[PDB]
Design an enzyme around this catalytic site. Sequence first.
Site, mmCIF file in Angstrom:
data_model
loop_
_atom_site.group_PDB
_atom_site.id
_atom_site.type_symbol
_atom_site.label_atom_id
_atom_site.label_comp_id
_atom_site.label_asym_id
_atom_site.label_seq_id
_atom_site.Cartn_x
_atom_site.Cartn_y
_atom_site.Cartn_z
ATOM 1 N N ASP A 115 0.712 -1.305 0.000
ATOM 2 C CA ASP A 115 0.000 0.000 0.000
ATOM 3 C C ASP A 115 0.725 1.329 0.000
ATOM 4 O OD1 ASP A 115 -1.699 -2.269 0.059
ATOM 5 O OD2 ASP A 115 -3.330 -1.137 1.004
ATOM 6 N N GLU A 117 -0.813 -7.517 -7.048
ATOM 7 C CA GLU A 117 -1.894 -8.268 -6.374
ATOM 8 C C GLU A 117 -3.261 -7.999 -7.005
ATOM 9 O OE1 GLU A 117 -1.146 -6.065 -2.369
ATOM 10 O OE2 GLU A 117 -3.312 -5.941 -2.884
HETATM 11 N N1 LIG Z 1 -2.307 -5.015 -0.014
HETATM 12 C C1 LIG Z 1 -3.763 -5.240 0.193
HETATM 13 C C2 LIG Z 1 -4.175 -6.733 0.265
HETATM 14 O O1 LIG Z 1 -3.657 -7.394 1.448
HETATM 15 C C3 LIG Z 1 -5.702 -6.817 0.284
HETATM 16 O O2 LIG Z 1 -6.146 -8.156 0.412
HETATM 17 C C4 LIG Z 1 -6.289 -6.152 -0.996
HETATM 18 C C5 LIG Z 1 -7.808 -6.208 -1.047
HETATM 19 O O3 LIG Z 1 -8.324 -5.433 0.044
HETATM 20 O O4 LIG Z 1 -5.980 -4.739 -0.838
HETATM 21 C C6 LIG Z 1 -4.595 -4.430 -0.831
HETATM 22 O O5 LIG Z 1 -4.691 -3.134 -0.252
#
Ligand SMILES: N[C@@H]1[C@@H](O)[C@H](O)[C@@H](CO)O[C@H]1O
Length: 857
Positions: free
Chosen positions: A428, A500
């Site tokens: 983040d 991610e």
């Molecule tokens: N780095 C995070 C993850 O850990 C999370 O699962 C995904 C969905 O909320 O958001 C991102 O901010």
Amino acid sequence: LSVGAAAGNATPIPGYVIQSSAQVSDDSAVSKPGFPTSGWYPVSSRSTVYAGLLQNGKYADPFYSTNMQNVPAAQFSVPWWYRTDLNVDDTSSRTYLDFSGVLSKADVWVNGTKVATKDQVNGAYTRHDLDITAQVHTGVNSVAFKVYPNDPNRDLSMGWIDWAQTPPDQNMGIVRDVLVRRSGAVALRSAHVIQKLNSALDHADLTVKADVRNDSANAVQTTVAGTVAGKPISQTVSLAAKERKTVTFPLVGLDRPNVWWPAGMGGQHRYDLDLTASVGGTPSDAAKSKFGVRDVKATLNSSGGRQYSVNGKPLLIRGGGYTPDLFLRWNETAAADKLKYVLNLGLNTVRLEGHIEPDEFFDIADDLGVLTMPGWECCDKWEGQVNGEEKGEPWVESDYPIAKASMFSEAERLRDHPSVISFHIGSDFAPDRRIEQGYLDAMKAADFLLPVIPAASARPSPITGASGMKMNGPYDYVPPVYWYDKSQKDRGGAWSFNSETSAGVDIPTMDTLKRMMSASELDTMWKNPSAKQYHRSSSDTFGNLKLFGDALTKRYGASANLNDFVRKAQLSQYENVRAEFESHSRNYTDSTNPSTGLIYWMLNSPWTSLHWQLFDAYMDQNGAYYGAKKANEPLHIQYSHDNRSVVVINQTSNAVSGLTATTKLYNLDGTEKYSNTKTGLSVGALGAKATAVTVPAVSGLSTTYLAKNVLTDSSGKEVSRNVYWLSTKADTLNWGGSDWYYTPQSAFADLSGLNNLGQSAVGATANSVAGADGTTTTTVTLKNTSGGRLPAFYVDSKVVDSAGKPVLPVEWNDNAVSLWPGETTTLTAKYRTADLKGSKPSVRISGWNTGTQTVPA
Ligand SMILES: N[C@@H]1[C@@H](O)[C@H](O)[C@@H](CO)O[C@H]1O
């Protein structure tokens, strides 16, 4: 627990008895030999409190239904004690406790003396090296940790973000080994090998470094000697009483080094470092370790994307976000099984967003050639100073040295594991200047020389600078064509480094479903996807399956029952995960704004789950698993959802020539409507591509139809088969309705014709060989035996015992296959003979339009 006096002894404490501080009125009493522990819970090494309680009976399986909600969590708002006896026959040697993995912090006690407080022993990742020589005597000694409650928003620890549900104890306890070390006057610590390879990869230079600390009352001379990579080394230094020095060895050259490579690019060799520090011509301490000879770089390309390379070979990162068990229950075989699934998927990388695993996890990753991307996690204490209204507390002065020490201890742990390709100092949010400086300093102090990434989002840090990554979502349902987007610079299409992302819900196999949820919970799941599911997320946003259910109904057709919902879920998940990977493989070699990485959210789940996984908590393999495996084949053919181009991808280390790509469209009645055969295709190594053909707008297709893509090598061998179920009706995005986690659709593909695909038949023979290596290989020969024109579509083979229970873990060469009339495939599954538990093996075979049978294997 007995420990010998031998110099270099380092023995893990194999277990503890535990109990709440609610039952302990006098802290000093606990670590006195003879302290009664009636009613205390015996627990293995590396146990959280709740995992210990489960080990003893004490609560029902949290993997089933809402069992975890029935645990009173108040009992975990006070400290718990971890106690053990220790027999010492000989106190001639000094005695140390060397450990990390304490959540959140602890007082440490030996024989009635508090040797360290929770102010010192604080933070999950901090390493401690406590000299307890003054306290230790011959005979039965006792050691006790008073372990404080964990709150991941307050403590520099581990939390679960929104991946699952909150463990009742917040994982308080000791989740790595506590070592009892013995040594003489001089302790040896932090031995490591700086390694630098030339660009030709045929010569390396090694600088061995090791610290020696004179814990005795008098000045000594010590000799640190041994071997690095088969070569002898020796240095002698003086140490004042209480002095610690870093010994640097003269440079050692290594010719023709056995270079470590990622899986499929060469071997996974690690060299050995073996040292002894000697005093007075007698060993005082000793340490053995490994290191790999590998270069890694991670630079920003001309488009601003983070681009990794290993030994000068650029790679597209193709991976998943890895998580340990929800209660941090450690099993070395299980870690191996999980990393082995990475390679069975054809992936090359796992990301660890915090929860950074014990050393053996990285040893296994090294040995298998799986790349690792460790780093701190978002959304709790770690980012609390920079993340505004998000969870996690602002930092106070005492937080800063805990974070820096955590970084030093992880850098020291990770630096000689060749699998490690970077450390994310932010997730983040990027750290601020003060925090970032602390991390860079810690890494320099540890000789941690790997790439530092400031964030997994597009947020820069002040010093390291631009991330080269993006975090734009989605994390919930988006249609397959979404992933081919490059037009939306705030979304998750195939360009830059996708650190991610997924399409959210990932319903596991029926076998797993029946193990994790009650009849009534499963009934709600398919009848009302809008209802909250405990086995999805504690997050409001991801509390239910609504987006997934709405899309499944729109695009597959309404579910007639649970079996219908599940079969359709598997196609939707295979279709989606496949497109997610394939789009990123394709755009990797774009001239502008290429995709340079993909981390699927997530590889796996901390528990039994309904989302963000490829393999489930029992290691079963569903449509998401098979779709990922399909997309990541080493020589692969695929269909582009955006523009209808048939593309060949070569993941292998060598360029390949003389390939033919054959593309055929069929209506659901079996009628061929299009055929193209493109011979003589060449494709470069390590992710390069070639376009076979752009399928034209063909007339007379059924609303749902099939595209059968087949790649054959110059010998004529079929090397890749890939079957798509497609619609004449496009999925399209309402981009302006986008939120942070998804983009809604303005129109939906119609794949509902699959409901009425006629029955076909298979066609099955199986045999097994139990090997001398403790593995059995089961071979299955499948044939479409039907008399008409219909393919046997989406045929899933499962190794099962005599009761029809899946044998897991399992590794297939291929699965979820589609066979036209008279066609045959031979599939191969490998698993530990012991996992059959005495049963003969059989193979359950279920196809979308072929029913279910089991044959003996
Ligand atoms: N780095 C995070 C993850 O850990 C999370 O699962 C995904 C969905 O909320 O958001 C991102 O901010």
